Design a protein around this ligand. Sequence first.
Ligand SMILES: Nc1ncnc2c1ncn2[C@@H]1O[C@H](COP(=O)(O)OP(=O)(O)OP(O)(O)=S)[C@@H](O)[C@H]1O
Ligand SMILES: [Zn+2]
Length: 409
Amino acid sequence: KDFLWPAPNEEQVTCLKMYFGHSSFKPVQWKVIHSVLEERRDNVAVMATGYGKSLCFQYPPVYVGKIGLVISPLISLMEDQVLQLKMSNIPACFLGSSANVLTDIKLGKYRIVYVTPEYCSGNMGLLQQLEADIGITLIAVDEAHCIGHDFRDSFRKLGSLKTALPMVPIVALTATASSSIREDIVACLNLRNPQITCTGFDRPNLYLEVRRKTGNILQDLQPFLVKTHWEFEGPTIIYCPSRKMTQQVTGELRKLNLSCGTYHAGMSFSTRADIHHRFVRDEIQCVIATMGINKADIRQVIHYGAPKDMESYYQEIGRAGRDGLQSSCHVLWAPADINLNRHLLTEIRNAKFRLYKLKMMAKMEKYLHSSRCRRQIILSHFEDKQVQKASLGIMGTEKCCDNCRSALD
Ligand SMILES: Nc1ncnc2c1ncn2[C@@H]1O[C@H](COP(=O)(O)OP(=O)(O)OP(O)(O)=S)[C@@H](O)[C@H]1O
Ligand SMILES: [Zn+2]
């Protein structure tokens, strides 16, 4: 149910507004936050993209004014989150093998402390000292940050956190309902009677289509344009596989006077914040991207070129129709696309990582070539086997996907 129990009190709701700008907690967020704060319980939160997984670990230490330890091997992503938190008046730091920051962590100056798994393995005694002196509200581990080609490959070394900090709850975030992966998480992290919550993975308001490329950027994108200078039907994100393609597509759209912005990891935090703000305010109609985009009313997502893998594809299309209204997500691809080029995978000498990447690429290729319901493929991929009635209602209809629509011809 979407009934929050117990109800967030006045101190909790005003804190949420002051530090995060939100007026209410979402149901799965609240289940996790409450369990961490009141029950001090480990949690495995299976959360679909765009739900609000980050609040699960950022809010509790901010509310009690203690430390949330966020463990990830993605150093540049953590450095960027420090800056997002800074803009909300939440002090955060990255702690690594950091003389001026460790002294300040011991003084209570930081709410969120980002560390790599490598750092944790060598400094358990230091983390025990922080828990004894200040208190650690929670430890957060995101399974998705293992994109090192496995949760075990990325976080194997964390099988000592729970033994060093037995009373500190761990919140493990995952973007898949796979029982095998949940078992891998519980076992690797030594979770004690964890609370398991899941959001479900369908987004019924997204029409899914896959179409082959025609041999020219403007020729491929022309069908998405409506007359006025021509423009898209609504706010649109175009995902490209490389910074070069992002600039090529941007250059072509600008020949048609489309209002565009680019969004990639080569840009600074401040330049990305400006594009995001302008897209949110509808001062630009299209963002061409290669670090998410949160906007309520994205009406169209286009992957210009085959996506990398099902997980990133799903996260990317998930930015669409966050308001619940009808949106469309189209993949324009060709077998020669760089994300299906087996050469760089075939170059890997190691047998294990060459097999993992080849398996991911094969799953993506099978989805692109499929004549089956695209929605069912996605739901099955994320092992969301208990399909919701809403999903059964959308599937098979003209608004589900291109294959469902052509079966109705
Ligand atoms: N309680 C809330 N109410 C309204 N918005 C929220 C709430 N919690 C989080 N959000 C927003 O939801 C968006 C998604 O949250 P994130 O924790 O960044 O999840 P994410 O799956 O990494 O998002 P994407 O998919 O990468 S855009 C962010 O803009 C949050 O600010
Ligand atoms: Zn379908």
